[PDB]
Design a protein around this ligand. Structure first.
Ligand SMILES: Cc1cc(=O)n(C)c2ccc(S(=O)(=O)NCc3ccccc3)cc12
Ligand SMILES: [Cl-]
Ligand SMILES: [Cl-]
Ligand SMILES: [Cl-]
Ligand SMILES: [Cl-]
Ligand SMILES: [Mn+2]
Ligand SMILES: [Mn+2]
Ligand SMILES: [Mn+2]
Ligand SMILES: [Mn+2]
Lengths: 190, 314
């Protein structure tokens, strides 16, 4: 039958065993993909010293990815953009990358669960059929409030490359963006 | 040592201009001891005038290349000043690689917001986003020596006699030694539209690129080259040129275009030479840039042509 990712079987780097006892359920809910032939999938986590409502308010802005991601020269949306599911964005990337542009579709925008899902539907790049989900999770550590972001993706392995190659590259970009999100979110919270 | 040079710096098919360059003639008074010692009797000889040439191929943005254009030669002069207030053949080579290494590392740290920058006190602030960087290829030319310092895949090539001699070696991640250095530092190199550090950056060394420290380092390769009566020209250029044209052919074309200009136009009055571009060098730089575009280079293209002959008679 169809095959599925199993990111719930391992604690991602940067999460505690206690945190994962809660987050494990969220991996099943939001970060499980049906795998197609010759695809690659990864789950990344990032702790943020900010309340989950602050992190989500940043993450949810599908029209402004440059506020919490690297590599973007410019991003445009529709003239009548309303942030409905099915919105698209056209992104121009900075120079020097193995990619120049990206066209992306907003597939999940769940303000009730704080989950954002996007599918790459075009552009000049080598991550064909990339789909990703980021989910935001709040914790109260005896007065101390923090957030863990979970971000996963599934993508085709491009011809000429291995799954190890593809995960190394995609993980690197996702991790770097998650580190910008930390900086942007923590700088809005004393 | 009258500086003879010409330059072209074009954006070409790219949506942004991220190449920069700097030419500063008569910029430095290099202590004669950094170039040579005494030998049997020139007491007047206390320094030689040094001419500065630099090409900076930016990536991820323009601000690092622009900063190198505005700052790097002043950081070099500051390094040399520290040696004049603190004062061997093999020693000279080591001294120059120390001077240029310190200069390149100072600029890199200023860019990253980790070294303070002069404020008309010093301010710690990144010049550009952490994903912005630049190559740097720099040449110091005086009557006796050429010093080249390179970080990245822009290139300086000396034409001596009939042989093109690269004075830099491209810092690409698949270079055997650079590949080993990156992996030894804990990094990874992936073939992903060419050899790239973590699949992202197609360069093993650069100025800037804070996010890929300490895999992508600013330490340059430095070449201390005695000059020779056989020297013809020195070419500094970004890979917008070298990606479509061969080292030998570029040098030979520059020489032939310089000679063609002189054959048709004679030489300028020597009172006018060294003030601005040399028309023969400019004709060579112009021609090389138009050939690069004709050959389909779709990149920014920046070229400095330097004539190393005192005179050209037929
Ligand atoms: C599609 C794509 C491929 C590629 O190789 N790179 C370097 C990218 C860099 C950035 C982006 S973007 O910021 O527009 N979308 C966010 C994003 C980040 C990372 C992966 C997919 C989408 C997209 C890409
Ligand atoms: Cl472009
Ligand atoms: Cl920039
Ligand atoms: Cl020719
Ligand atoms: Cl000519
Ligand atoms: Mn460039
Ligand atoms: Mn650096
Ligand atoms: Mn190239
Ligand atoms: Mn280039």
């Amino acid at each position: 039958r169809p095959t599925y990712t199993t990111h719930h079987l391992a604690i991602p780097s940067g999460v505690t065993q206690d945190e994962f006892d809660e987050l494990k359920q969220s991996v099943v809910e939001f970060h499980t993909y049906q795998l197609s032939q010759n695809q690659c999938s990864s789950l990344l986590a990032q702790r943020i010293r900010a309340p989950n409502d602050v992190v989500w308010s940043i993450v949810r802005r599908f029209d402004q990815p440059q506020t919490y991601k690297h590599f973007i020269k410019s991003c445009s949306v529709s003239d009548n953009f309303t942030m409905a599911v099915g919105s698209t964005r056209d992104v121009n990337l900075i120079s020097g990358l193995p990619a120049a542009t990206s066209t992306e579709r907003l597939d999940i925008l769940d303000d009730d669960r704080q989950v954002l899902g996007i599918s790459i539907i075009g552009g000049e790049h080598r991550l064909r059929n990339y789909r990703s989900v980021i989910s935001v999770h709040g914790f109260n550590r005896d007065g101390a409030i923090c957030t863990v972001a979970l971000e996963s993706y599934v993508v085709d392995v491009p011809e000429g490359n291995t799954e190890e190659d593809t995960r190394l590259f995609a993980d690197t970009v996702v991790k770097l963006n998650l580190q910008k999100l930390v900086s942007v979110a923590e700088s809005q919270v004393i | 040592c009258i500086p003879l040079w010409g330059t072209v710096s074009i954006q070409g098919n790219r949506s942004e201009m991220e190449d920069a360059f700097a030419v500063s003639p008569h910029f430095l008074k290099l202590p004669i001891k950094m170039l040579m010692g005494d030998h049997e009797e020139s007491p007047s000889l206390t320094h030689l005038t040094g001419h500065f040439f630099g090409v900076y191929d930016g990536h991820g943005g323009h601000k690092v290349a622009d900063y190198c254009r505005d700052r790097l030669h002043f950081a070099l002069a500051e390094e040399i000043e520290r040696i004049k207030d603190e004062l061997t053949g093999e020693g000279r080579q080591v001294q120059w690689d120390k001077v240029f290494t310190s200069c390149f590392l100072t600029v890199d740290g200023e860019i990253e917001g980790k070294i303070g920058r002069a404020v008309v006190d010093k301010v710690l602030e990144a010049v550009a986003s952490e994903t912005v960087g630049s190559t740097a290829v720099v040449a110091l030319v005086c009557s006796s020596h050429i010093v080249v310092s390179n970080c990245g895949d822009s290139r300086a090539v000396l034409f001596r006699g009939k042989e093109a001699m690269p004075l830099s070696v491209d810092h690409k991640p698949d270079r055997e030694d650079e590949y080993a250095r990156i992996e030894n530092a804990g990094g990874k190199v992936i073939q992903w539209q060419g050899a790239r550090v973590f699949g992202v950056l197609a360069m093993s060394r650069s100025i800037g690129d804070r996010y890929l420290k300490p895999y992508v380092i600013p330490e340059p390769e430095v070449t201390f080259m005695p000059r020779s009566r056989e020297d013809e020209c020195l070419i500094l250029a970004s890979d917008g040129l070298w990606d479509v044209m061969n080292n030998q052919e570029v040098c030979e074309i520059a020489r032939r275009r310089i000679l063609m200009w002189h054959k048709k136009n004679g030489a300028p009055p020597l009172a006018e030479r060294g003030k601005g571009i040399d028309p023969a060098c400019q004709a060579a730089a112009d021609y090389l840039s138009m050939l690069a575009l004709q050959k389909g280079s779709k990149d920014n293209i920046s070229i400095i042509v330097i004539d190393l002959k005192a005179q050209r008679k037929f």
